[PDB]
Ligand binder design. Structure first.
Ligand SMILES: *[C@@H]1O[C@H](CO)[C@@H](O[C@@H]2O[C@H](CO)[C@@H](O[C@@H]3O[C@H](CO)[C@@H](O)[C@H](O)[C@@H]3O)[C@H](O)[C@H]2NC(C)=O)[C@H](O)[C@H]1NC(C)=O
Ligand SMILES: *[C@@H]1O[C@H](CO)[C@@H](O[C@@H]2O[C@H](CO)[C@@H](O)[C@H](O)[C@H]2NC(C)=O)[C@H](O)[C@H]1NC(C)=O
Ligand SMILES: *[C@@H]1O[C@H](CO)[C@@H](O[C@@H]2O[C@H](CO)[C@@H](O)[C@H](O)[C@H]2NC(C)=O)[C@H](O)[C@H]1NC(C)=O
Ligand SMILES: CSc1nc(NC2CCCC2)c([N+](=O)[O-])c(NC2CCCC2)n1
Ligand SMILES: *[C@@H]1O[C@H](CO)[C@@H](O)[C@H](O)[C@H]1NC(C)=O
Ligand SMILES: *[C@@H]1O[C@H](CO)[C@@H](O)[C@H](O)[C@H]1NC(C)=O
Ligand SMILES: *[C@@H]1O[C@H](CO)[C@@H](O)[C@H](O)[C@H]1NC(C)=O
Ligand SMILES: *[C@@H]1O[C@H](CO)[C@@H](O)[C@H](O)[C@H]1NC(C)=O
Ligand SMILES: *[C@@H]1O[C@H](CO)[C@@H](O)[C@H](O)[C@H]1NC(C)=O
Ligand SMILES: *[C@@H]1O[C@H](CO)[C@@H](O)[C@H](O)[C@H]1NC(C)=O
Ligand SMILES: CP(=O)(O)CCCN
Lengths: 696, 689
């Protein structure tokens, strides 16, 4: 049978650094050809493989490629290429000869752009198969705030550029994005200042020691963070990072406790399950044949990913050769001067589809790349252990429990907790002021008892029993206001707060009006009796009627406001979030109010009408001062009372209107302003008549 | 008949740097001159084998295999742009050939260990970094950011720039990279909000990055872009089907960027090695072309290609047996290398030194884009640091932008409305105090002579006048005086406050003390605590005020009050200007105030309450006195209640714009007015009566 030959390039000698890799995969392919040669699926033909040398050199590689083109038989495909420069140099110029390349060790991420690499396929998961898997890991632990730390090379930037397109659409956001070139821990301080807790890293082996040394000084370890680091490093990569002790600022035992439990992402060499594959043996069987096939050459990690490429090439040739045509399809296979474009297209479009269970799972392609398998590892007890798996065609993630662990007792969290808190009044202050107001209430009860007891005894001025009762009832009605002031949102539960705030003004204004009216009615009566004179009672209840009219008009002044114009709560906040007493839960303060959109108005009218009432009282004091009447009349106590009340009120209003951000001082101001005024008024009213009646 | 030899050449005519359109005719103007002069080559002709490449490595590899395996044996190779030059120079070691480039400017091509048989006439690309750093120091910036396309031609240049920028304090903050799609780096640069951007990419990627910088509004008033200079003259007004933007959506996008380039032609008027000046070559070349010289790509790199033939002609004439050169013999190649290494002459671009780390040219050129046209700002020299500026740059607002900053602002208050009213209210009363004092002096006292001696009333009048005249040291601040003599302003405040209250309050308190203690006590009083003479009241007033003098002099010489700044929250909107306001407020305080002020206020308040108790317990008993004790009781009650209400308020309020000044001023003025009028109305009443 006439043969058909395929080209292959790999290192062979021992004077290079990557020759053993070739010597690690040369026996395995040496089996696979025999597996064809005993059955001969390509029955009228015969497979041939030519081998050449690259030695990881650009000049030697191009010289060997040119010599194999010039002094070689008709080739069909090229299979191999392991060095990350000569592979790209070969692959970028394949359209000029209409050839197809199949690689098994080129894992650089730049080879995924099929706009200038149309004729290149590989059977190994590249560095872009990490970005989906990581995403699924987040959906096993619910982390939605991540920060990235990358180097600045080509291969370490392609992954970071692809990660954004992978994590777009889901509800996951990239909080920070830093990048270094030679000094890693200038940006580690920025990541510390931004307070991130999940870190995704992309850097080579040399910078890993510097990163893990700089992360120990800033205290970015323990059971509060989680690192996702690539894991294609060689074993024991940390015990030989320093031949001498020339890696100071970080010691050994203070580094092994710094890089504790990071997560490493890699691919998987073989398949864990077991069926009968396309060859006719189990993967454990094939592993046994490979392990007793080689004599003394050490094992590699690419011997499985090369055994399937030969069967891929064989199935491609068998499925592309046996098309509908026979005579032309058997005639056009020796005139290939690397110029036949139709043969290149009919090879490529048949190579595009392939689907079978090899030794590493299903062999399926997507836009040139391969769907594979991802493996997870963790650093435990100064050792690395395999902990999980992630399929790609089924898109599932299996976690091997009884192996994974965490430093605490639960998975860590992405960020601390924000807690809103209200600012309450001090309870000792409320107790003290309530006790003082209660004592004032008992003294008012004693004063009212005295006023009703001797109301018709020894003719004590025979004036204003009912009016004095109305004054002291107004004071009693005013004390309930300072009973009512000190509320809290925890003690109202938003049940009566929208009503107590607008009846406090009701009770306060009614008490104020009735107190000053029952004060002024006496002096109005004394001015009325000493004019237009033979004297008698001038009015039994007409003064009560006119003070009731004053109270009614000033109460309707309030009531005709709550029909269209409201005044309700506007709770505000002050985001100046400190720490608690040793805790980490960030708390913010917010406090409530009872305001309106017209707070600068609805005060001048009531203040001006109270000033008019004060001026009328001043007129009454003027009319009564020039009499020098006996103790039945009073023109000095009323003046002392109004002078001591007006200044205190006009100070206390402007003081209490300003201190809004200090809720524990305005209560103490308003309480004293109310209690001192009421006590002084009651003492100036009652006890001058009381001492006189006690003297008798 | 003369024999003929052949050279190989690749001419890029499309792609990232179309140069061949101006470089292929120029060589065709040189060869016809070098094969016609019998002096330089007596028995040889040179022929050219040219191939188009677009300087893409695939077609370059195909045409290199085509060239290396044909029948006419070649001598030298001539590549085009750097991506082909590096590949040819790395691969030519196995055939013993000579690479002579004319358009490559990679800084990494200076490493002689990897490229043994490579020569070039184009200068190195590290000549832009001594310029740009200079332009970072004239306008004063320190935080920049870069964006590059990941090819080694720009990677080595970025490495050299970040190495040479460390010696000037400037530091890189944000780095980005992309291979084919720049959308994600532009998105990250917008989200990180950098302000000074340096771009490093080819010509075809400039449109594919600017159509994506337009769709995120990363331009305008506060962004500066640094670019390269060898682009075409109208590189945005052309039709490209690989983008979606329109020409008016890019002309507004590329407005206001800075370009730097290197000159490539001797500006003087000399005579070259080929009997031709430095502008007749330009005129002849422009005549030889077909299209306009403004849009022909690679027009600046024509004399380099014109010299690259003459240098080899002179070297091969210095060698002068060129008919048996194989592809595996070494002994001819080292001879040609040593003959080429020791060559130097003058051509069109100047003196050819031909073996250094580059840098045989000196000057540069800086340009800006205004209104869709290029304008040359000013030249530069590298050695003597010459910079011949010309002031032809139009920014927005006549000034270039900068990075983010922060301003510091001290507080003031209503320096006219709230202050002049207090001043005129004080001036209205300070003269009434002294005219009432004069009326107490010169009037013939009869009822006052029957009353107490008026000297202790002159004390009270002087005390309230000196207390009233203390608002002027209180309202002044850093608006006028508060720079250096601030401690003397605090001294005026504290001395006036310590005097003017104590004098008048003592002069009332001793009268109320005596008018209590004389009347109803028969235990031990006869000539006690003092003598009868007005020296009695004078001495007890002196003791009381001397106490106050000791209190002021202890912590005025042990712990004075110098100055104190307080700073709280910031970030006012600042009226759409790129600035952030930081407010502070300064006031006069020691290290400790809440102890001394507290103990002094308590010591005075106990005495004030004792005074009002002693004033209340006697009301309406009088003998030999006209109107003294009732009036001083009313005045001391008013002063007591006003001070006790006002004083603990001004310690709480620290926002002293209109609260802490107003409370103290109103209290002082009202207390002084009421005290004066109540104390000295009845003297005028009984004098006019
Ligand atoms: C290249 O070099 C040659 C010589 O160095 C330049 O030749 C030009 O030659 C003409 C012809 O002689 C000169 O014109 C006249 O020559 C007569 C000779 O009888 C003389 O009597 C006149 O006074 C006049 O010189 C011409 O001057 C000379 N050119 C110059 C610039 O001197 C030729 O110009 C050079 N090529 C270029 C492009 O400059
Ligand atoms: C490569 O092969 C795959 C697998 O067949 C193609 O994907 C689908 O192929 C079927 C038929 O083979 C079509 O009907 C579908 O429309 C294809 N697409 C999808 C999304 O199912 C793929 O199209 C092939 N590649 C090319 C370039 O044709
Ligand atoms: C090119 O090289 C030749 C020698 O091969 C040089 O010609 C010589 O010129 C000098 C001039 O003084 C004569 O003395 C010699 O006899 C010449 N040599 C021969 C072999 O004839 C020529 O000058 C060179 N061209 C230059 C330097 O431009
Ligand atoms: C010494 S005469 C006196 N004048 C008083 N006012 C006057 C009107 C204006 C300021 C002075 C008061 N007053 O307004 O309370 C007053 N009160 C005493 C009774 C209880 C103890 C104190 N005594
Ligand atoms: C080929 O297969 C036959 C049976 O199918 C077996 O007897 C023989 O040993 C095989 N030979 C090789 C070289 O595998
Ligand atoms: C000492 O440390 C330097 C880096 O600081 C390193 O380059 C060098 O190789 C070290 N020397 C030895 C003997 O380990
Ligand atoms: C090129 O192909 C033709 C048929 O298309 C064949 O006759 C010829 O021999 C081929 N060239 C070589 C060098 O084999
Ligand atoms: C892992 O944990 C789950 C419940 O926490 C348990 O049901 C499961 O059996 C564990 N895995 C193994 C392998 O035991
Ligand atoms: C190279 O050329 C020199 C001189 O022409 C000759 O002496 C030598 O033998 C040659 N080397 C070969 C043919 O390997
Ligand atoms: C090229 O000439 C210079 C000039 O002295 C010399 O220093 C250098 O070593 C020469 N190059 C070689 C490869 O010898
Ligand atoms: C970017 P390159 O050096 O290849 C072309 C430079 C032309 N002056």
């Amino acid at each position: 049978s006439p043969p058909l030959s395929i080209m292959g390039l790999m290192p062979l000698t021992k004077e290079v650094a990557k020759g053993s890799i070739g010597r690690g995969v040369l026996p395995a392919v040496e089996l696979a050809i025999e597996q064809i040669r005993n059955e001969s699926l390509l029955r009228p033909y015969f497979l041939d493989l030519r081998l050449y040398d690259t030695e990881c050199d650009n000049a030697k590689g191009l010289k060997a490629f040119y010599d194999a083109i010039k002094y070689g038989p008709n080739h069909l495909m090229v299979f191999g290429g392991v060095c990350p420069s000569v592979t790209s140099i070969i692959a970028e110029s394949l359209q000029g000869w209409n050839l197809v390349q199949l690689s098994f060790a080129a894992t650089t991420p730049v080879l995924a752009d099929k706009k200038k690499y149309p004729y290149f396929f590989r059977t190994v998961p590249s560095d872009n198969a990490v970005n989906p898997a990581i995403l699924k890991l987040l959906k096993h632990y619910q982390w939605k705030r991540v920060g990235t730390l990358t180097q600045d090379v080509q291969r370490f930037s392609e992954v970071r550029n692809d990660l954004t397109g992978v994590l777009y659409g889901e509800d996951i956001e990239i909080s920070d994005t830093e990048s270094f070139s030679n000094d890693p821990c200038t940006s580690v301080k920025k990541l510390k200042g931004n307070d991130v807790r999940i870190i995704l890293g992309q850097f080579d082996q040399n910078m890993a020691a510097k990163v893990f040394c700089c992360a120990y000084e800033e205290n970015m370890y323990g059971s509060k963070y989680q690192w996702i680091i690539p894991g294609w490093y060689e074993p024991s990569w940390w015990e030989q990072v320093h031949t001498e002790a020339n890696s100071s600022r970080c010691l050994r035992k203070n580094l092994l406790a710094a890089m504790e439990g990071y997560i490493g992402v890699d691919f998987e060499p073989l398949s864990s399950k077991q069926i009968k594959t396309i060859s006719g043996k189990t993967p454990q069987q094939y592993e046994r044949e490979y392990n007793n096939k080689r004599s003394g050459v050490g094992p590699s990690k690419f011997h499985g990913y090369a055994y399937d490429g030969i069967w891929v090439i064989a199935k491609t040739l068998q499925r592309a050769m046996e098309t509908l045509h026979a005579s032309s399809r058997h005639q056009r296979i020796q005139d290939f001067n690397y110029t036949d474009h139709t043969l290149g297209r009919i090879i490529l479009n048949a190579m595009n589809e392939t689907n079978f269970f090899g030794v590493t799972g299903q062999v399926v392609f997507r836009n040139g790349e391969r769907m594979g398998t991802i493996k997870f590892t963790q650093f435990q007890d100064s050792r690395e252990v395999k902990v999980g798996e992630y399929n790609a065609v089924a898109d599932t993630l299996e976690i091997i429990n009884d192996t994974i662990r965490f430093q605490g007792s639960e998975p860590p969290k992405d960020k601390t907790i924000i807690l809103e808190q209200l600012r309450k009044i001090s309870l000792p202050l409320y107790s003290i002021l309530s006790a003082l107001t209660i004592l004032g209430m008992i003294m008012a009860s004693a004063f009212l008892f005295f006023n009703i007891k001797n109301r018709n005894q020894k003719l004590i001025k025979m004036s204003s029993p009912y009016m004095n009762n109305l004054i002291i009832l107004g004071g009693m009605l005013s004390y309930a206001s300072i009973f009512l002031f000190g509320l809290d949102g925890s003690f109202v539960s938003e049940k009566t707060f929208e009503t107590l705030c607008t009846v406090r003004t009701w009770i306060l204004t009614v008490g104020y009006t009735t107190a000053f009216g029952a004060m002024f009615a006496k002096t109005w009566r004394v001015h009325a009796i000493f004019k237009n004179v033979k004297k008698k009672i001038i009015k039994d209840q007409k003064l009560l009627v006119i003070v009731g009219g004053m109270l009614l008009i000033d109460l309707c002044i309030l009531i005709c406001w709550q029909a269209v114009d409201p005044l309700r709560r506007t709770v505000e906040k002050y985001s100046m979030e400190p720490d608690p007493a040793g805790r980490d839960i960030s708390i913010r303060p917010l406090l409530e109010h009872c305001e309106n959109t017209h707070m600068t108005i609805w005060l001048g009218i009531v203040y001006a009408y109270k000033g008019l009432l004060m001026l009328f009282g001043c007129f009454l004091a003027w009319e009564t001062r020039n009499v020098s009447i006996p103790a039945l009349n009073d023109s000095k106590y009323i003046g002392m009372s109004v002078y001591n009340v007006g200044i205190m009120c006009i100070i206390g209003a402007a003081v209490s209107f300003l201190t809004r951000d200090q809720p524990n001082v305005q209560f103490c101001i308003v309480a004293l302003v109310i209690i001192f005024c009421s006590t002084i008024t009651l003492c100036l009213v009652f006890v001058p008549k009381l001492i006189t009646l006690r003297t008798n | 008949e003369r024999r003929a030899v052949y050279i190989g050449a690749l001419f890029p005519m499309s792609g990232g740097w179309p140069g061949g359109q101006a470089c292929q005719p120029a060589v065709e103007m040189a060869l016809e001159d070098v094969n016609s002069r019998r002096d330089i080559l007596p028995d040889y002709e040179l022929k050219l084998i040219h191939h188009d490449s677009k300087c893409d490595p695939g077609q370059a590899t195909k045409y290199l295999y085509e060239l290396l395996y044909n029948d006419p044996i070649k001598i030298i190779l001539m590549p085009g742009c750097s991506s082909v030059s590096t590949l040819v120079a790395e691969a030519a070691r196995m055939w013993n050939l000579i690479v002579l480039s004319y358009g490559s400017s990679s800084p990494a091509l200076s490493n002689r260990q990897r490229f043994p048989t490579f020569f070039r006439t184009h200068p190195s690309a590290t000549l832009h970094n001594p310029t740009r750093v200079k332009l970072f120091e004239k306008w004063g910036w320190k935080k920049i950011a870069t964006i590059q396309q990941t090819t080694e031609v720009f990677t080595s240049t970025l490495d050299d720039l970040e190495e040479r920028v460390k010696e000037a304090g400037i530091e890189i903050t944000f780095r980005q990279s992309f291979f084919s799609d720049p959308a994600v780096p532009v998105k990250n640069l917008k989200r990180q909000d950098a302000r000074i951007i340096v771009g490093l990419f080819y010509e075809t990627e400039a449109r594919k990055v600017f159509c994506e910088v337009y769709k995120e509004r990363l331009f305008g008033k506060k962004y500066v872009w640094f670019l390269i200079g060898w682009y075409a003259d109208n590189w945005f007004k052309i039709y490209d089907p690989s983008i979606n933007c329109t020409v008016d959506e890019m002309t507004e996008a590329v407005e206001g960027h800075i370009t730097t380039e290197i000159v490539m032609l001797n500006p003087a008027n000399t005579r070259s090695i080929s009997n031709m000046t430095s502008q007749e070559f330009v005129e002849k070349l422009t005549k030889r072309l077909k299209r306009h010289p403004e849009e022909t790509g690679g027009f600046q790199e024509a004399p380099l290609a014109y010299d690259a033939i003459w240098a080899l002609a002179l070297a091969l004439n210095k060698t002068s047996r060129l008919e048996d050169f194989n592809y595996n013999n070494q002994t001819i190649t080292d001879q040609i290398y040593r003959a080429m290494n020791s060559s130097s002459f003058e051509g069109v671009s100047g003196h050819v030194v031909f073996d250094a780390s580059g840098s045989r040219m000196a000057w540069t050129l800086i340009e800006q884009l205004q209104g869709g046209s290029y304008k040359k700002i000013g030249y530069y020299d590298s050695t003597k640091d010459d910079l011949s500026w010309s002031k032809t740059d139009k920014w927005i607002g006549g000034s270039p932008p900068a990075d983010q900053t922060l301003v510091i602002k001290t507080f003031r208050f209503l320096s006219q409305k709230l202050f002049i009213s207090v001043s005129v209210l004080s001036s209205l009363g300070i003269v009434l105090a002294v005219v009432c004092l004069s009326f107490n002096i010169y009037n013939s006292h009869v009822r006052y002579i029957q009353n107490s001696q008026p000297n202790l009333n002159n004390l009270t009048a002087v005390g309230c006048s000196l207390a009233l005249a203390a608002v002027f040291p209180l309202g002044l601040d850093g608006y006028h005086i508060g720079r250096n003599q601030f401690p003397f302003v605090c001294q005026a405040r504290l001395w006036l406050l310590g005097l003017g209250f104590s004098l008048g309050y003592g002069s009332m308190f001793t009268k109320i003390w005596w008018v209590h203690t004389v009347f109803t006590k028969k235990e031990e009083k006869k000539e006690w605590r003092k003598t009868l003479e007005p020296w009695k009241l004078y001495a007890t007033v002196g003791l009381l005020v001397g106490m106050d003098v000791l209190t002021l002099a202890i912590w005025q010489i042990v712990d004075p009050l110098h100055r104190t700044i307080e700073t709280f929250a910031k970030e006012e909107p600042k009226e759409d200007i790129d600035v952030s306001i930081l407010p502070q407020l300064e006031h006069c305080s020691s290290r400790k105030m809440n102890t001394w002020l507290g103990i002094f206020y308590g010591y005075k308040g106990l005495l004030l309450l004792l005074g009002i108790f002693l004033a209340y317990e006697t009301k309406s008993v009088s003998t030999e006195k006209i109107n003294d004790h009732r009036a001083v009781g009313m005045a001391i009650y008013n002063v007591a209640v006003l001070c006790l209400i006002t004083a603990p308020v001004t310690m709480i309020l620290s926002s002293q714009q209109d609260a802490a000044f107003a409370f103290a001023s109103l209290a002082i003025v009202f207390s002084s007015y009421i005290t004066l009028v109540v104390l000295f109305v009845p003297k005028m009443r009984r004098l006019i009566t």
